[PDB]
């Protein structure tokens, strides 16, 4: 059984739109999305389809770029730090579940290298 995906909508949660959050959607997310190694991270891990019954038993805070993209588009975040935390969770999740050799890990590392260089250039709040 797959769990419910992370929430991308919640009217109770305080929301903001900031140039940093705009940057995260416009630059950071768009670069990673169009990348060739993006496809495994573009949606939640369907552990049923992939026959990974253990995945959600070990991964307790799942996160993927589809969810992140929805959150950015639906103005879900208060600050850039929340979004950055989601991207990092996604990478860490992948390193925890998989062995260091695996293709998925090489794909995550290439994406992360890209993520970390774009985050270096996260603008000061305006
Ligand atoms: C290796 C499984 C995995 C994916 C992934 O999605 N792989 C995948 C998905 C489909 S698919 O049929 O579901 N179509 C999209 C088909 C084939 C593959 C290899 N993503 C992450 C983060 C992981 C893990 C466990 O870290």
Curated annotation (Swiss-Prot):
Per UniProt, subunit arrangement is: Interacts with p53/TP53; the interaction is direct. Interacts (via CTD region) with CDK9 and CCNT1, acting as an associated component of P-TEFb complex. Interacts with RELA (when acetylated at 'Lys-310'). Interacts (via NET domain) with NSD3, CHD4, BICRA and ATAD5. The interaction with BICRA bridges BRD4 to the GBAF complex. Interacts (via NET domain) with JMJD6 (via JmjC and N-terminal domains); the interaction is stronger in presence of ssRNA and recruits JMJD6 on distal enhancers. Interacts with NSD3. Interacts with NIPBL. (Microbial infection) Interacts with bovine papillomavirus type 1 regulatory protein E2. This interactions may serve for the tethering of viral genomes to host mitotic chromosomes allowing successful partitioning of the viral genome during cell division.
What's in the domain note? The NET domain mediates interaction with a number of chromatin proteins involved in transcription regulation (NSD3, JMJD6, CHD4, GLTSCR1 and ATAD5).
User: From what organism does this protein derive?
Assistant: Homo sapiens (Human)
For the cross-link Glycyl lysine isopeptide (Lys-Gly) (interchain with G-Cter in SUMO2), list the residue numbers: 57
**Localization:** Nucleus; Chromosome
Q: Which residues form the Bromo domain?
A: 16-122
The reported result of mutating residue 98 to A is: Abolishes binding to acetylated histones
Q: In which tissues is it expressed?
A: Ubiquitously expressed.
Report the protein's function: Chromatin reader protein that recognizes and binds acetylated histones and plays a key role in transmission of epigenetic memory across cell divisions and transcription regulation. Remains associated with acetylated chromatin throughout the entire cell cycle and provides epigenetic memory for postmitotic G1 gene transcription by preserving acetylated chromatin status and maintaining high-order chromatin structure. During interphase, plays a key role in regulating the transcription of signal-inducible genes by associating with the P-TEFb complex and recruiting it to promoters.
Q: What else is known?
A: JQ1, a thieno-triazolo-1,4-diazepine derivative, and I-BET, a benzodiazepine derivative, have been tested on tumors with success. Treatment with GSK1210151A (I-BET151, a I-BET derivative) has strong effets on mixed lineage leukemia and promotes myeloid differentiation and leukemia stem-cell depletion.
Top-level taxon:
Eukaryota
Q: Tell me which family the UniProt entry assigns to this protein.
A: Belongs to the BET family.
Q: How is it modified after translation?
A: Phosphorylation by CK2 disrupt the intramolecular binding between the bromo domain 2 and the NPS region and promotes binding between the NPS and the BID regions, leading to activate the protein and promote binding to acetylated histones. In absence of phosphorylation, BRD4 does not localize to p53/TP53 target gene promoters, phosphorylation promoting recruitment to p53/TP53 target promoters.
**Which residues of this protein are annotated with the site description Acetylated histone binding?**
98
What disorder does this protein's entry note?
Cornelia de Lange syndrome 6: A form of Cornelia de Lange syndrome, a clinically heterogeneous developmental disorder associated with malformations affecting multiple systems. It is characterized by facial dysmorphisms, abnormal hands and feet, growth delay, cognitive retardation, hirsutism, gastroesophageal dysfunction and cardiac, ophthalmologic and genitourinary anomalies. CDLS6 inheritance is autosomal dominant. A chromosomal aberration involving BRD4 is found in a rare, aggressive, and lethal carcinoma arising in midline organs of young people. Translocation t(15;19)(q14;p13) with NUTM1 which produces a BRD4-NUTM1 fusion protein.
User: What is the official name of this protein in its record?
Assistant: Bromodomain-containing protein 4
